[PDB]
Paper text:
The transition to the ‘up’ state exposures of RBD for the binding to hACE2 is also a prerequisite for S-mediated viral fusion, directly correlating with infectivity. Here, we dissected the role of N354-linked glycosylation, acquired by BA.2.86 sub-lineages, as a RBD conformational control element in attenuating viral infectivity.
To further structurally verify this, we determined the cryo-EM structure of the BA.2.86 S-trimer in complex with hACE2.
Author numbering:
A (entry chain A): 534 to 677, 689 to 726
B (entry chain C): 727 to 1064
C (entry chain A): 968 to 1144
D (entry chain A): 47 to 68, 80 to 138, 158 to 209, 215 to 246, 263 to 436
E (entry chain B): 727 to 774
């Protein structure tokens, strides 16, 4: 069986990996396939004489994003470095290691470059970054009546200089400011 | 100048005991030993993001160049953004981005094509198979170019005033007159040899791209950073095939071959070796992070002093008497044009 | 932590095993504690190096901002630097940078030079500013409009090479008296 | 302190099976049973534990009464209702204070709630209780009473009733990580699970009841395998077992014919289907666990003898056929065939 | 101000297993625990 995470025990090689079709050029005397860093990569099926790859099942990490618990109790979950379509189907078939299940209402699905976020909605405005998520995406708790959104951070207030070839601006006043460094 | 390094979040149990309950249980006995390694890697990642922020986000407002480009005859096309390019990068940015090759991009979501690799799976897939991952930068390589464009378009239409308070406009010939006056030679010489200074400026800007294009490696610093990180990751992966003085080097077949109450010793030796290897990786990463942090602090100071004003300390902003500087973005670094 | 031994209390393992086998067990605890001590001391060395770098920066900042005023930009606070005051904090220092920040500004006009009679006149310090009708001289960082005098304008030029030059009259306090 | 422990605990916000009374299903037991009951004075007398509930395996009796308890582990036969009818091979008798505490402030409105939790990890039958005078939300810890090393098998749990002329909040414990906040005077005012909600493990990861705004890397996720294939190479090349078991001129015992067996794969179903057989006495190899053993060389000797000589062929024997024609070594490992 | 330090070139094979083939073979099982040290020392020397 192919195209599924399956515990294999090929000819004594125990492990867990996704198996599929490949276009290697295994010579007639070859059985295994390895890499530069010496990991078993492609295994010629003994009873199929074909070429089948091995791939990490779904190695990632879970990060929970939330405002302060004294303000609210809601949370959102981000799965590091995996198109959430795979995690979505995996939730739907119930084979993820984390037993905690965050809600999927359809409005909370966002494919970032850092994974895919679930539990928050995409507003297309731009504000100062509050909770750094990754790859130019920030999230924040904002009154609607309250929820957690996803947006792209704004680099700053938009301004344009008025440059001209014979015009200057000269200050007519001043102010004195006291900053601090620690 | 390098500014930041690739960001990694290795995880103990997946690295050290491939999905083995007994091996994880025996790893648990060592207390919060590998917890320090995690916290350390998280600190490294946050430091990298902060380094990029300090170096580049020096201005609070994004200015934009005027539609026309005629600054008294001076030529800045080679450095200002080029609208035709989809990435919106200057040609000097483009040469820099095309001369640097990254082993692991990180923002690829390469999962899904490791099964479809057809040929032997590469470094990225091999690393991902043993619980080793790379996180993407918070600020993409695109908005860094936008920060650089704002800094560039503030320098050539307002002088050094935008770095202190409000931006005040002033013609580029007058700005250059004051920059000449700052090095002890009066503005008269500029108002007499405007044409010669413009022509020399153009010629220098023209030949810098040839100097960068023809050289074998003038970008050696960033490339060494990338190569060192990739080599460290490869030597971390390669240790899982080392026997470390036991029967075998693989947990899956060490458990499938020997029973718990006698394979306990073998699992313990494997645990010791792999834990020490992870310790070494983390310590070297900490030292390299300190070095890159020092370099990033120097780069931030150099930007703040040479770009938003002209410096008097000698041989700091280039050999000779300083007049200007222009920033350009590079992969995991910055480039100054003194 | 047991570190792969019988127990994590040295005295406890002693009263339940023969000395030779107990010694075997004893080594396991010692090695784990040693590796722990090595980790602690190495991280302490890293932290001490970073603190020393910060302390050197603080010493330099104290010396330059407090015992004088600096021309380095964005070093002793944002803006044009005026003063600095030190304060003491637990395991650190706190500076109070006093800076001068400009204020409300106005588009005026400008001129690279002014050609009175065949000669280009330039402002010793400052810019040439036209209100819109009359030409004057001023500073850069503050607006103090002043009548055009030769005392503020040195003469060197020929009124033919300055791109964007304009025209007006210049004044001297010498021909009047 | 905010001690974080790993032990068999009833899951938080998990469902519990609330029964009524007015026929007492024998609920299972696995990794502990959490108990609860609220009542006016008393309707529950005793408990019985174990598997098969009969006089063949060991079971448990902890029945209370007005003043004391009756803790014992015995082999009670049946009650079907005077709670037992068998105490032949039974021991482990213990007596102590009664488990039921009831107090009333001159009114029956103080329906004290009785939460009970037990376990038998490495035996050692632990007993706990706590009475607090749908289901209350305010937390309540549990205090231990007795700790006894029973060391028997437990699969099912039963509760007895009382007589008269709303309870049974029954849960189960699992190996779970819990975080418990302890007072300055040593009570437990709260507890939070570590595998129920993202916020729960978010608190457990930093072991702090208050979490500030931010994003925290908590755990690692992994798609567990959907199925498990095992695949091994192909098989072929059988032996001449049909050619050795179906000859026509089996030699006499005075010259026992020896056939050498090598370079094959060993089909052993033919050793079963061939003939109704008369003797299958194996000595050194289990007759069913023989397909899982690998041999270097095998010999097969075939001859004909009488009926008594068949039983005579055995390690360490005597007679005219075991001393003059064929001798079998005492340390022989194999199987004999006779039909 | 100090500017540099001495450049050491320790070699693990002779340091750990003085010219003994059995100890060399046993040390060979601990992975590439020596090439990293040699690389670090060489980098330090070039830096000086
Ligand atoms: C320059 O800017 C100052 C503020 O930074 C002005 O000071 C203000 O003065 C008003 C009264 O005129 C006060 O009410 C106020 O609190 C503040 O001190 C100052 O007037 C201004 N001067 C000019 C010439 O614009
Ligand atoms: C300013 O610098 C530009 C750098 O790109 C010059 O553009 C050039 O355009 C010519 C054709 O017009 C190309 O052949 C060449 O490769 C380059 O892209 C530009 O001409 C130059 N002009 C001035 C005013 O200095
Ligand atoms: C030109 O610059 C002059 C500054 O001295 C301004 O003239 C002023 O005009 C008033 C009366 O209109 C005089 O009383 C005063 O002494 C001063 O000269 C004038 O506003 C300015 N013109 C423009 C167009 O900015
Ligand atoms: C300033 O005034 C000068 C005369 O006082 C101008 O010079 C003149 O230039 C014209 C041609 O432009 C000649 O025909 C004339 O003889 C005289 O040389 C000068 O152009 C003027 N400058 C500006 C900017 O108006
Ligand atoms: C732990 O035990 C202490 C002694 O019983 C409690 O202090 C008491 O507080 C009561 C009032 O609550 C006083 O009346 C009494 O004199 C004594 O000081 C203490 O509160 C308790 N800790 C708790 C309840 O958290
Ligand atoms: C394995 O053996 C079976 C039975 O002889 C045969 O049908 C099959 O093709 C064999 N497979 C291979 C790959 O040799
Ligand atoms: C993962 O990302 C998307 C989302 O489904 C999809 O194109 C595919 O499954 C994966 N893409 C790549 C580039 O691996
Ligand atoms: C609005 O947000 C959607 C995503 O919800 C995005 O696809 C779209 O481009 C946004 N439009 C604007 C104008 O920002
Ligand atoms: C200034 O003058 C030059 C030369 O005539 C012209 O090309 C440029 O467009 C002018 N600047 C503006 C802002 O119009
Ligand atoms: C000068 O005039 C332009 C006109 O668009 C304006 O945008 C700019 O702010 C002015 N400069 C000032 C007010 O300093
Ligand atoms: C308890 O059982 C009910 C079915 O009656 C189910 O809906 C619920 O999810 C269960 N509890 C938990 C915590 O899953
Ligand atoms: C209650 O149980 C105890 C347990 O030994 C027993 O001695 C006593 O007789 C029983 N009856 C009463 C009324 O206490
Ligand atoms: C107790 O068990 C032993 C087991 O051999 C048995 O001999 C004895 O008869 C039993 N006692 C009874 C049944 O009373
Ligand atoms: C307990 O009973 C179960 C099923 O009845 C059985 O599988 C298990 O081996 C028993 N344990 C002991 C210690 O007898
Ligand atoms: C021996 O072989 C013959 C044919 O070769 C067959 O008819 C006979 O049944 C076999 N003997 C037994 C006992 O099956
Ligand atoms: C078994 O008998 C055959 C035929 O009689 C003979 O060729 C062979 O040598 C005999 N094997 C012995 C006696 O071991």
């Amino acid at each position: 069986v192919k195209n599924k995470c399956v515990n294999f025990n090929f000819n004594g090689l125990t492990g867990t990996g996704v198996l599929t079709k490949s276009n290697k050029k295994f010579l007639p005397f070859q059985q295994f396939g390895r890499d530069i860093v010496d990991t078993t990569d492609a295994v010629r099926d003994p009873q199929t004489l074909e070429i089948l790859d091995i791939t990490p099942c779904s190695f990632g990490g879970v990060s929970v994003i939330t405002p302060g618990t004294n303000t609210s109790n809601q949370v959102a979950v981000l799965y590091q470095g995996v198109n959430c379509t795979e995690v979505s189907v995996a939730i739907h078939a119930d084979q993820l290691t984390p037993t905690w299940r965050v809600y999927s209402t359809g409005s909370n699905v966002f494919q970032t470059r850092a994974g895919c976020l679930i539990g928050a909605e995409y507003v297309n405005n731009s504000y100062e970054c509050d909770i750094p998520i990754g790859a130019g995406i920030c999230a924040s708790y904002q009154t609607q009546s309250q929820s957690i959104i996803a947006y792209t951070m704004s680099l700053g207030a938009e301004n344009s200089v008025a440059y001209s070839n014979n015009s200057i601006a000269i200050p007519t006043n001043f102010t004195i400011s006291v900053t601090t460094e620690i | 100048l390098p500014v930041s390094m690739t960001k990694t979040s290795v995880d103990c149990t997946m690295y050290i005991c491939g999905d083995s309950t007994e091996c994880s249980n025996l790893l648990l006995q060592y207390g919060s030993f590998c917890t320090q390694l995690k916290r350390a890697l998280t600190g490294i990642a946050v430091e990298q993001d902060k380094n990029t922020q300090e170096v580049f986000a020096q201005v609070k407002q994004i200015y934009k160049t005027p539609p026309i480009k005629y600054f008294g005859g001076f030529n800045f096309s080679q450095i200002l953004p080029d609208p035709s390019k989809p990435s919106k990068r200057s040609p000097i940015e483009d040469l820099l981005f095309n001369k640097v090759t990254l082993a692991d991009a990180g923002f690829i979501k390469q999962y899904g094509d490791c099964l479809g690799d057809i040929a032997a799976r590469d470094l990225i897939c091999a690393q991902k198979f043993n619980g080793l991952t790379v996180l993407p930068p918070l600020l993409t390589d695109e908005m860094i170019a936008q920060y650089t464009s704002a800094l560039l378009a503030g320098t050539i239409t307002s002088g050094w005033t935008f770095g202190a308070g409000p931006a005040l406009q002033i013609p580029f010939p007058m700005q250059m007159a004051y920059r000449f006056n700052g090095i002890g030679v009066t503005q008269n010489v500029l108002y007499e040899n405007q044409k010669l200074i413009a022509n020399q400026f153009n010629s220098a800007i023209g030949k810098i791209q040839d100097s960068l294009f023809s050289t074998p490696s003038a970008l050696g610093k960033l490339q060494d950073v990338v190569n060192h990180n990739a080599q460290a990751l490869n030597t971390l992966v390669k240790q899982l095939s080392s026997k470390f003085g036991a029967i075998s080097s693989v947990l899956n077949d060490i458990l499938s071959r020997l029973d718990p109450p006698e394979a306990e010793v073998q699992i313990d030796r494997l645990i010791t070796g792999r834990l020490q290897s992870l310790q070494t990786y983390v310590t070297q990463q900490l030292i390299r992070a300190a070095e890159i942090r020092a370099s990033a602090n120097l780069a931030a100071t150099k930007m703040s002093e040479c770009v938003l004003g002209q410096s008097k300390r000698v041989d700091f902003c280039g050999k000779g008497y300083h007049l200007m500087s222009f920033p350009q973005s590079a992969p995991h670094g910055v480039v100054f044009l003194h | 932590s047991k570190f792969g031994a019988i127990s994590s209390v040295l005295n406890d393992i002693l009263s339940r095993l023969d000395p030779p086998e107990a010694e075997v067990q004893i080594d396991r605890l010692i090695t784990g504690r040693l590796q722990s001590l090595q980790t602690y001391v190495t991280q302490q060395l890293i932290r001490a190096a970073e603190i020393r770098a910060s302390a050197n920066l603080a010493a330099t900042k104290m010396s330059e901002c407090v015992l004088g005023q600096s021309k380095r930009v964005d070093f002793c606070g944002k803006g044009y630097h005026l003063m600095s005051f030190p304060q003491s904090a637990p395991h650190g220092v706190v500076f109070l940078h006093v800076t001068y920040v400009p204020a409300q500004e106005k588009n005026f006009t400008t001129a690279p030079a002014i050609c009175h009679d065949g000669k280009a006149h330039f402002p010793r310090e400052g810019v040439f500013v036209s209100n819109g009708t009359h030409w004057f001289v001023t500073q850069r960082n503050f607006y103090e409009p002043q009548i055009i005098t030769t005392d503020n304008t040195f003469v060197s030029g020929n009124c033919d090479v300055v791109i964007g030059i304009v025209n007006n009259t210049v004044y001297d306090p010498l021909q009047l008296e | 302190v905010l001690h974080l422990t790993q032990d068999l605990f009833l899951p938080f916000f998990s469902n519990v099976t609330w029964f009524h009374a007015i026929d007492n299903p024998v609920l299972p037991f696995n990794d502990g049973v959490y108990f609860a009951s609220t009542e006016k004075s008393n309707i529950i007398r005793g408990w019985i534990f174990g598997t098969t509930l009969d006089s063949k395996t060991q079971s448990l009796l902890i029945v209370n009464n007005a003043t004391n308890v009756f803790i014992k582990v015995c082999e009670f036969q049946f009650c079907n209702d005077g709670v037992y009818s068998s105490a032949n091979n039974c021991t482990f008798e213990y007596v102590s204070q009664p488990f039921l505490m009831d107090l009333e402030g001159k009114q029956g409105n103080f329906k004290n709630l009785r939460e009970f939790v037990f376990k038998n990890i490495d035996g050692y039958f632990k007993i706990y209780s706590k009475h607090t005078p749908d289901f209350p939300q305010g937390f309540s810890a549990l205090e231990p009473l007795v700790d006894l090393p029973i060391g028997i098998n437990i699969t099912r749990f039963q509760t007895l009733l009382a007589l008269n002329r709303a309870d049974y909040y029954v849960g189960y414990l699992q190996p779970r990580t819990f975080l418990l906040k302890y007072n300055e005077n040593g009570t437990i005012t709260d507890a939070v699970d570590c595998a129920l909600d993202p916020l729960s493990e978010t608190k457990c990861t930093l072991k702090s009841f208050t979490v500030e705004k931010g994003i925290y890397q908590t755990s690692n996720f992994r798609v567990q395998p959907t199925e498990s294939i095992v695949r091994f190479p192909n098989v072929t090349n059988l032996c001449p077992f049909h050619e050795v078991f179906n000859a026509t001129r089996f030699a006499s015992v005075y010259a026992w014919n020896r056939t050498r067996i090598s370079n094959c794969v060993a089909d052993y179903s033919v050793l079963y289907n061939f003939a109704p057989f008369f003797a299958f006495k194996c000595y050194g190899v289990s007759p069913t666990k023989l397909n899982d053993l690998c041999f270097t060389n095998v010999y097969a000797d075939s001859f004909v003898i009488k009926g008594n000589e068949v039983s005579q062929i055995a390690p360490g024997q005597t007679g005219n056929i075991a001393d003059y024609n064929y001798k079998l070594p005492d340390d022989f490992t194999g199987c004999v065939i006779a039909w």
